[PDB]
């Protein structure tokens, strides 16, 4: 149900020239069709001198290594659904010298050949998860006046930094959507000694992540600290699960009865946490 | 014999015989090794549709 095409070339003029052995490995739960490989092998103008297949793992022995783009493809069938999304592996070994190999990575047709990481610096971090909370408690029925915001921030599942941020523009880098934006007020922080108003902060979210964030609006952001830093010095922060995002209402959106005394409670929380900070 | 001296060191050789003394220092440096294959290069592309379980 899935088609494959391995491709091989050799730079040459090194002295290593000769036959090569391929170690292409399919995804989980796949296995190639023996008939297709046999048909490729049986031809007089043969490129696959020998083949062998046991489930996912398929070997390809090449008698001649072309210098330019000249390669061969086949087909594989699935029988068990894959439990995750990740790139797979593929390796080529020189026939007379297995040490001088070449490992290469490949991913799903709609996915990338590398994982989503933001490290880009001396420290390194990675960004797998479910990004968008897209929570608006005022327009729905789950909001309460109990005051669990402090519980969420300082007790469980615990939150590090505190900011309310006004969005400037929406940007996209690699598989990540960058939100260039301006700080309005600093609520709390753990390590950002440079925290202040009218500063530059960058918030990043995966492109696959279906979060919607309209530029020009003021959003409330709460989450765990990042470790990547911007190109101009400011620490950059990442959007993922356990990240709290909200859009505050307006006066016309706070006087109304379906959020009466709840929007005011949220503003009181914001002021109290900005002033007092966490307790116990 | 091993020693732990991170600064300039002194020598006070004494003896009628003559010989060769050499010192080895081991440390890490800024890496420059290429991450891309140099002699043989393999690229594989997969096309089609893949079924997956409940994720994303």
């Amino acid at each position, epitope marked *: 149900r899935v088609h494959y095409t391995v491709c091989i070339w050799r730079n040459g003029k090194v002295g290593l020239s000769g036959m090569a052995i391929a170690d292409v490995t399919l995804l989980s739960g796949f296995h190639a069709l023996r008939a297709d490989l046999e*048909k490729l092998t049986s031809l007089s103008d043969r490129y696959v001198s020998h083949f062998e297949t046991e489930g996912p793992h398929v070997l390809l022995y090449f008698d001649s290594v072309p210098t330019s783009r000249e*390669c061969v493809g086949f087909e594989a069938v699935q029988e068990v659904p894959v439990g995750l999304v990740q790139p797979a592996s593929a390796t080529l070994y020189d026939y007379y010298n297995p040490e001088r190999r070449c490992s290469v990575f490949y991913g799903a047709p709609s996915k990338s050949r590398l994982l989503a990481t933001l490290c880009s610096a001396e420290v390194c971090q990675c960004a797998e998860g479910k990004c968008p909370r897209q929570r608006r408690a005022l327009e729905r029925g789950l909001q309460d006046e109990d005051g669990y915001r402090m519980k969420f921030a300082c007790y469980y599942p615990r939150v590090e930094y505190g900011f309310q941020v006004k969005v400037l523009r929406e940007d996209s880098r690699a598989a990540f959507r960058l939100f260039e934006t301006k700080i309005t007020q600093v609520l709390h922080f753990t390590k950002d000694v440079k925290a202040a108003a009218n500063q530059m902060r960058n918030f990043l979210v995966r492109a696959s992540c279906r979060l919607r964030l309209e530029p020009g609006k003021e959003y409330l952001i709460m989450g765990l600290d990042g470790a990547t830093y911007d190109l101009e010095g400011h620490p950059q922060y990442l959007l993922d699960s356990n990240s709290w995002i909200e859009e505050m209402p307006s006066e016309r959106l706070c006087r109304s009865t379906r959020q009466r005394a709840a929007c005011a409670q949220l503003n009181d929380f914001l002021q109290e946490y900005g002033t007092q900070g966490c307790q116990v | 014999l091993q020693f732990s001296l991170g600064s300039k060191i002194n020598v006070k050789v004494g003896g009628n015989s003559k010989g060769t003394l050499k010192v080895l220092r081991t440390y890490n440096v800024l890496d420059m090794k290429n991450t891309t294959c140099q002699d043989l290069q393999i690229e594989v592309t997969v096309k089609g549709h893949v079924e997956y379980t409940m994720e994303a």
Partner: nanobody
Amino acid sequence: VQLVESGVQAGGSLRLSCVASERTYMAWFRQAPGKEREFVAAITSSGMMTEYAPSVKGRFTISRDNAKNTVYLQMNSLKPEDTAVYYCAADLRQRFGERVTEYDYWGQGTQVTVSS
């Protein structure tokens, strides 16, 4: 390894057959006069998966026979601007989806005309 192909008011249905000596994955290409040749669709050796040109999504279907070693292409709902010579050709390396023209031993084709 030779290709034999054999087989009109607009909006109808049509059936062109291409037969090959060897069980292979021959696709179909079209060439209108005054312009370079382009593909319409393709199929693998097994025949359980196909591909179609973006202008003919959901309108044309390729089928293959296990015994007679041929291909079944149906042209229901003909388009008036679909008149060209249609070719059937392949290679021997199972390089499916090889859209740019590096197929060998191209068939000699059949002109088909569409009248409005």
